[model samples]
Each structure stands twice: as C-alpha cells, then as structure tokens.
Target chain A: RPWQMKDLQAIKQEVSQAAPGSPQFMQTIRLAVQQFDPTAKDLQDLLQYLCSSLVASLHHQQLDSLISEAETRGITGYNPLAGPLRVQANNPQQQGLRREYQQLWLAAFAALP
Target chain B: RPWQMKDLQAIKQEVSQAAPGSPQFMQTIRLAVQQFDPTAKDLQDLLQYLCSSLVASLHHQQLDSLISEAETRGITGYNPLAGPLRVQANNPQQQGLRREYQQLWLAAFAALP
Candidate 1:
C-alpha cells in the first residue's frame, strides 16, 4: 500500500543485493520515502533523514568502521560539549553487520560541495 | 562582543566583496554562527544552516540564480504536493543577492557521506 522508495531502494540494492534479508531495513526506507516532501527545506530534512539513517539500514561494518577511519585522522572536533566525530548509528542487534563496503564516504561528501 | 562564525564569515567574505555594505547580512551570519553547536547531529544541522544561509549572506545573485539553473534542469521535482523544485529563499529585499557563488552545491553534497 505504501509507495516504493526509488532513491533509497537504489541505495539498498547497491548494499544489500546479495544479502537482502531484512524487511525492517526496507520498511524504514519505505517509511522515509513515504514522508518525503518536495520543498527544499522539507526535502533536505528528508534527505538528511535518509543520510543519517544509512548506518542503521545496514547490518554492516562500513559505517561502523568510519570511527576507526576518523580515529586514524585524529579528531573529535574542537568542541568538548559535542560528540567528537560526526558518525551516526542505531539498532544494536543489526550493528556491526555489512552487506558490502563501498565508498559511501566519497558519495556523502560528494553532496557537500 | 560575540565570537565570529569562521565558516560563515569565510563564506560571507567570498560572496560580499564590492557590494559589502549590508549590516543586516553580517548580523544574520553572526546569528547563525552564534547558534552553532559542534556535535555530529548538531554540527550537521549547523552546517546545513550554514549552507542554507549562504544565499542570504551574499547580497548578490548567486543563490537566486539557482532557480534558473534548476529550471534549466526542468524540475519542480515529482511532487505537485510540494513546491515546484528544491530551492529555498527568505527576505525579498535582498533576494537574488550573491557573493562568490562558489560550488556550494558541490560542497553541500561533499558532506553527504
């Protein structure tokens, strides 16, 4: 009954093609897309939601490994009040899982500039 | 009296050079920077705020022209339920203002990962 998520589905396909076993992950994508609004502000919020949800959508170590990569870079930002690095994650059971590792980092930063 | 917004000030300097006579624009930038909190989620929110505020800091035509460029792309997205395309604006007096018009689009996407 829900509309299919094209962008999210495309991302899912890339990461979960061989190991697609999670209905919940797919559902989250559908839900996010279902809430999509086209105005710049709302759309950006949705896109942000989509981006932030990426780590949760995977049962992968790629997102998890970002901390290591960041650690290698040596940061945590200049703010002691903030959470050092800009990593996001959720869902413990599915944590540290992976479909495949790709240059998603490259992709995410691609949107910045 | 307040700390300067390094990123915003940097962006402002790039955009508002010859036409640099607006106190309001600088205030807006200062306000945004004052609100910045350096956390992952909060930092991105601030960064998003920084970016979305770029068009305003210019007092130029760069941000205003994005609609023209996006129009060239024939968008207004797929949602008639939302505004035509994913452009944002505020304050009509200074609408179409721009500074350097750097590849902020390119920069914005770079942070996506």
Candidate 2:
C-alpha cells in the first residue's frame, strides 16, 4: 500500500476545495472509502485505504481514457475529479458500468505499470 | 479542429452539472478560452479553440501524469478537473509553473501521440 500522510492531506485539500462546506465532500470521502475498503475500521483507516487505492488506480489506460472523455466534454480544469459522480447520479446504468470500468482500471494500476 | 455541436453541448452540460450555476463555471470557460486563443474573435471561435486544444492536450504523457498526481492526492470521482485552478489561485508561483508545464504538455500532445 502506498498510503501516506501527504496523500491524505492532498485528498482532504482537494475535497474541501471542490465543494467547500457542501455535504458532498464527506459523501465523496465515504464513497472513496467504501470503494477501497468495504469494511474500513474507521476514518483514519478509510483515508489510508483511499491513498492506497488512488496509487493503485493511476496505472490504468482506461482511467486516462475517462479523463480524456471528460476533457472532450468541456470539463477543463480540476473540476472533473467530481464530474463522474454527478454524471453517474443522473444515470444509474452508466454508474454501474463506470464502477465496473473503474474496477478494471484499478486492477490494471495494481499490476505492473 | 474537431469542434462540433456535440462538443459544445458536452461542455455546457458538464459545466452546469459540475457547479450548478456557480460563477466559477464561467470563469473556467473564460480561462479555457484565453489559454486556447489569446484573441478569440467570438464565443463560437473560443468554443472551437477549446475543442481543438482539448483534443491536442489529450496526446501528452505529462497531462496524464498530472491527472495521476491528482488521483494520488485523493481526488477521485471526477472532482480534480477544477482542483488545479483552485490550487493555482492560492499560490501564484505554483500557478505560473503549472501553466508553463501545461503549455509544454499541450505542445507535446500537438506534436504526436
């Protein structure tokens, strides 16, 4: 696991910046935790899991494709980090597909990059 | 240039979805225009420029790396699309550095995949 304090800090900063005082920030953090560890022990553990999962997700070509699709959609800047969730919210079928796609992406990232 | 009505629609949809009527959305659009065309003749030209520039930026390895960095920082679920700009606002020097880096990435993408 490549989880680190810096990763936690970065995640926190990124979340707060994206939504400020919105409930979505915490909701996102919880979603990330559940995605990383379905049985997370606590917030600290969840944060660690997120750090590890993120490190794991970086190696996927499909993940790159996701970002590319987002760009083509006029999602410039650092905002698309949360755009998929919103998109997913609008369409549950797409959300399910994206979750599976993201899982495959995570697996690839976990493998040798 | 691969500018199309679909691209414009996607951009508008993505923007409205991201912030839901926030001023930042318009600011982001403006920044994108300035980055793509220093003197865009009109909104249509600017939108076209954005479409083309996005296509070009997709070819850069560094751009992918930037996305990876965002992921490592716990920016999952499509939120980091606007994270960079917020980060830039807090630190001018870093913003300047990121701009230069992004320009290089754009050039590389324009050259070849």
Q: Which candidate's DockQ is highest? A: 2
Across A26-56, the per-residue lDDT of candidate 1 in tens digits comes to: 4543344345322222222233323333432
lDDT of 2: 0.41
Best by TM-score: 1
Name the lDDT value of residue A15 in candidate 1.
40
Chain A in model 2: its TM-score?
A: 0.27
lDDT string for model 2 (A1-113, tens) is: 32333333345446544432245554565455444432212232332323333442453344556545655665322234555432432343444434434443333333433
CAPRI quality band, candidate 1: incorrect
Alpha-carbon TM-score of each model against the true structure: 0.21, 0.20
Error of 1 at B4 (Å): 18
Cα displacement (angstroms), candidate 1, residue A46, comes to: 20
- The alpha-carbon lDDT assigned to residue A55 of candidate 2 equals 41
